[PDB]
Amino acid sequence: GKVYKKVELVGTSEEGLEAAIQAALARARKTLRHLDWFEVKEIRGTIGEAGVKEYQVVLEVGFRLEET
């Protein structure tokens, strides 16, 4: 029947976790069609003088493949 594909991305953001996630999805939408779900694999980040510099969320984005 239907077949999906999953790509692994790493969204980053200085705002927070949800922001990093949306950042990855926003870019995914530019080149991938039929985005359906995502799964968080890792949550990490860089440290600056004020604490967290950047949040980095590693996630898998699942999307439906078309006919051909």
Count, residues near Na ion per rule CB under 5 A: 3
Q: How far is the CB of 37 from its own copies (least distance, A)?
A: 5
The answer to the question of residue 35 lying near Na ion (CB under 5 A) is no
Q: Does 19 bind Na ion (CB under 5 A)?
A: no
Please name which of 18, 17, 15, 29 lies closest in space to residue 7, comparing C-alpha atoms: 29
Query: How far is 3 from 56, CA to CA, in rounded Å?
Result: 29
Q: Would you state the structure tokens that stand for residue 66, as one six-digit string? A: 């078309």
Instruction: For residue 32, give the 3-state DSSP assignment.
Output: coil
Binding positions for its own copies, 5-64, rule CB under 8 A: 5-14, 16-30, 35-40, 42-47, 51-52, 54-55, 58, 60-62
